[PDB]
Design a protein around this ligand. Structure first.
Ligand SMILES: NC[C@@H]1O[C@H](O[C@H]2[C@@H](O)[C@H](O[C@@H]3[C@@H](O)[C@H](N)C[C@H](N)[C@H]3O[C@H]3O[C@H](CN)[C@@H](OP(=O)(O)OC[C@H]4O[C@@H](n5cnc6c(N)ncnc65)[C@H](O)[C@@H]4O)[C@H](O)[C@H]3N)O[C@@H]2CO)[C@H](N)[C@@H](O)[C@@H]1O
Ligand SMILES: NC[C@@H]1O[C@H](O[C@H]2[C@@H](O)[C@H](O[C@@H]3[C@@H](O)[C@H](N)C[C@H](N)[C@H]3O[C@H]3O[C@H](CN)[C@@H](OP(=O)(O)OC[C@H]4O[C@@H](n5cnc6c(N)ncnc65)[C@H](O)[C@@H]4O)[C@H](O)[C@H]3N)O[C@@H]2CO)[C@H](N)[C@@H](O)[C@@H]1O
Ligand SMILES: NC[C@@H]1O[C@H](O[C@H]2[C@@H](O)[C@H](O[C@@H]3[C@@H](O)[C@H](N)C[C@H](N)[C@H]3O[C@H]3O[C@H](CN)[C@@H](OP(=O)(O)OC[C@H]4O[C@@H](n5cnc6c(N)ncnc65)[C@H](O)[C@@H]4O)[C@H](O)[C@H]3N)O[C@@H]2CO)[C@H](N)[C@@H](O)[C@@H]1O
Ligand SMILES: [Mg+2]
Ligand SMILES: [Mg+2]
Ligand SMILES: [Mg+2]
Ligand SMILES: [Mg+2]
Lengths: 252, 252
């Protein structure tokens, strides 16, 4: 029932069993095999799972195998070189959470240096893409949440406020991550690493204190804390040049 | 600054300005235009935004316009009839959260009853698709969370436990929603509607109380509530036959 305790030696044994099955099944279509996640960083804990990535020569290839044996769980990603390089060069709103997987790949097999090329791609993204992703995050995520908690203040339900506050704090950590071009190590340390950064929006550290401590029961403290962070976003975007275009009423 | 208070009449005025602009720009390539979300249900609050969907005749068309004027926010989706019908018939892990948009479409323009056809498509999905989505949710989300809180119990960090508990409760609502073929009304009512259903896994209602009340500061209580809900998942799927295949050690 659930994940069992495993050692780093047992997980690496499973990884090489999977590599041999990938090489047996696809032969010389395999360009590279690598380990990412906590195992690829060699910081896996007793209950950690396994994540692997595979680069195929078959163009347009994109599939994944993810399973459990009842005791442990594995995920193996299969991508063509172009699909993986393209995704490594796209900056979404959750880029600080997702793209850290490309900065600590443990090489297992590589016919033509593909694992190194992916690393150089994710690390050489031009500045304009982060600027555009920040403006998209403010409109698509922050402005949306602001309307939701302002509605809760006047019509409820306050039973959603703790969940929304976690989402607002997580989106703020993405904003800080995009600003500093930082990818957080893992999901469990996103908030802890975000508040340690410079150039934080005003009120973000206070909002994070509620979420990290789990004190989300005082709705009136949370709503005032959210409104201060939203005001801190307006000063922050002007301070850093991130101008969201508001001039047009219908922009198409 | 931020979303402004607006009435339902002012929001519908903006919608018809957008409809008139969509018809001028694409002409007879537009098959249908509809409003979904809270405005399409006529339950929009003072701070609610606007979501619209547009069915195009142009094949393989898929794009979206999402913007703000500084006072309000609009999102308009453009899809071909085949792409939209396909998406309405695929069941993902968050299907109970996303596909409610097809059950409360407000028709604004419809040349050939396309909006009703989309409704019939999303409403006639066969049972096996929900069965497979439930098995995938258990492995990809619930089993994943179980390893993270079991790691937190032995090595921390407990500052992630409140965020993780909110995510686990939301994933449990997806499980219940997939089982009963329920689309939750809105994101703010997911937990409120999930605990009112029948045939809940044991311990889910107790875990939900922490998230709905915001009392997520007692780390040791949360870990016991998570472990009880995880045990209730194994018994729930067994009583329900939802057997996740564990027979093979490498299933490809
Ligand atoms: N691979 C190239 C590229 O990937 C794209 O796909 C995306 C994304 O759509 C996809 O999500 C997977 C789902 O499609 C699938 N149904 C279930 C999988 N579990 C998803 O995998 C991704 O999400 C989980 C978490 N939900 C990640 O696992 P884990 O939390 O243990 O984290 C391990 C390491 O991965 C990084 N990380 C952390 N959180 C995330 C999230 N939320 N998303 C992505 N990466 C994350 C972090 O550094 C950590 O150390 C799992 O690793 C993750 N793969 O997955 C990929 C993006 O990874 C497209 N398929 C396509 O463009 C192309 O194939
Ligand atoms: N939405 C369109 C819809 O579907 C079809 O269109 C296809 C097609 O446009 C495209 O499919 C890919 C092809 O172009 C390509 N030539 C081969 C690829 N294999 C196709 O991708 C699809 O193939 C498999 C299906 N067995 C999917 O992978 P899988 O089932 O294992 O995914 C499981 C979950 O894991 C996530 N995932 C998948 N791959 C990765 C990687 N590399 N890293 C991380 N996560 C991954 C995934 O999100 C999933 O939840 C694969 O996902 C799938 N894209 O894209 C669509 C896919 O249907 C029809 N032609 C079209 O008419 C129809 O409207
Ligand atoms: N359109 C057909 C189909 O859609 C697919 O795309 C998905 C998904 O990828 C996409 O997400 C959008 C992002 O790509 C974009 N970067 C930002 C947009 N804001 C996203 O739109 C969706 O997510 C927001 C939530 N941040 C939804 O807003 P709102 O929360 O106010 O909810 C309004 C009503 O919509 C339903 N709902 C509630 N929560 C969700 C979530 N998380 N996802 C989807 N729907 C949700 C609910 O009933 C509520 O009453 C926003 O409405 C939503 N559109 O959006 C679509 C799915 O809608 C593919 N592009 C493709 O297969 C094809 O186009
Ligand atoms: Mg892992
Ligand atoms: Mg994982
Ligand atoms: Mg809305
Ligand atoms: Mg919206």
């Amino acid at each position: 029932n659930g994940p069992i305790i495993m050692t780093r030696e047992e997980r690496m044994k499973i990884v090489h069993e999977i590599k041999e099955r990938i090489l047996d099944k696809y032969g010389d279509d395999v360009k590279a095999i690598g380990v990412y996640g906590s195992l690829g960083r060699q910081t896996d804990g007793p209950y950690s799972d396994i994540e692997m990535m595979c680069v195929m020569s078959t163009e347009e290839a994109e599939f994944s195998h993810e399973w459990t044996t009842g005791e442990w769980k594995v995920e193996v990603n299969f991508d063509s070189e172009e699909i993986l390089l393209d995704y490594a060069s796209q900056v979404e709103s959750d880029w600080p959470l997702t793209h850290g997987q490309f900065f600590s790949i443990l090489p297992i097999y590589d016919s033509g240096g593909y694992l190194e090329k992916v690393y150089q791609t994710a690390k050489s993204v031009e500045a304009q893409k982060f600027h555009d992703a920040i403006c998209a995050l403010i409109v698509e995520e922050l402005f949306e949440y602001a309307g939701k908690w302002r509605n809760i203040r006047v019509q409820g339900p306050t039973t959603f406020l703790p969940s929304l506050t976690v989402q607002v704090a997580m989106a703020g950590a993405m904003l800080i991550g995009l600003h500093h071009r930082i990818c957080y190590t893992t999901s469990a340390s996103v908030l802890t690493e975000a508040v340690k950064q410079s150039d934080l929006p005003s009120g973000y550290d206070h909002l994070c204190q509620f979420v990290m401590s789990g004190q989300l029961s005082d709705s009136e403290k949370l709503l005032e804390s959210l409104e201060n962070f939203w005001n801190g976003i307006q000063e922050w975007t002007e301070r850093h040049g991130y101008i969201v275009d508001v001039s047009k009423r219908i922009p198409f």
